[PDB]
Amino acid sequence: APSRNGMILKPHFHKDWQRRVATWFNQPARKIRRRKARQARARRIAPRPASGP
């Protein structure tokens, strides 16, 4: 029940959302992995720009 003034607000937590929460504890581990993989790809394409084409 609403009590005296406030946004009549609609949250979208009626489905079973806690079954599909996606945490981000990866992200540092991820960020590194990309970065290694990046440095490897440079080293493979030896004098070619790391960039791409």
């Binding site: 029940a1 609403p2 009549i8 609609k10």
Partner: protein, 147 residues
């Protein structure tokens, strides 16, 4: 910080701050915005005048970038450029007037709030107000349309 919160101070007391005549039952009003019309109506129509009902035209595939038109007021037009354009001017003695490309700085329209200092300009912009035009002319300048 649980340490600071209220339930630490309620420990010992029976009702936990929810009273003992009426209690803390689950959902006595109904869940959420239930009763907007019936039984919660007064709150809705004294803090949300106009919740209920349709109005105006539908618009199916709205794409916001078509209507993109960020405005800027004369108020702070000179802010767009380095002070030393506004200084090398009120000086110079050619009656030059420096250009101000407003679209470069990220505003499309030029509306007309504020006093513009007596110091000629050439304002390039996608759109202008009527008043913004007038003020600009009164300074001794020239509005300039750009695509």
């Amino acid at each position: 910080p649980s340490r600071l919160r209220k339930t630490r101070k309620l420990r010992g007391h029976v009702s936990h701050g929810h009273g003992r005549i009426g209690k803390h039952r689950k959902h006595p009003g109904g869940r959420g915005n239930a009763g907007g019309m019936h039984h919660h109506r007064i709150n809705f129509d004294k803090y949300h005048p106009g919740y209920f009902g349709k109005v105006g035209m539908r618009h199916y595939h709205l794409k916001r970038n078509q209507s993109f038109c960020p405005t800027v007021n004369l108020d702070k037009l000179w802010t767009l450029v380095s002070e030393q354009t506004r200084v090398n001017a009120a000086k110079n003695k050619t009656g030059a007037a420096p250009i101000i490309d407003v679209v470069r700085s990220g505003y499309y329209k030029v509306l007309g709030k504020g006093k513009l200092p007596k110091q000629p300009v050439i304002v390039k912009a996608k759109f202008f107000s009527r008043r913004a035009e007038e003020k600009i002319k009164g300074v001794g300048g020239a509005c300039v349309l750009v695509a």
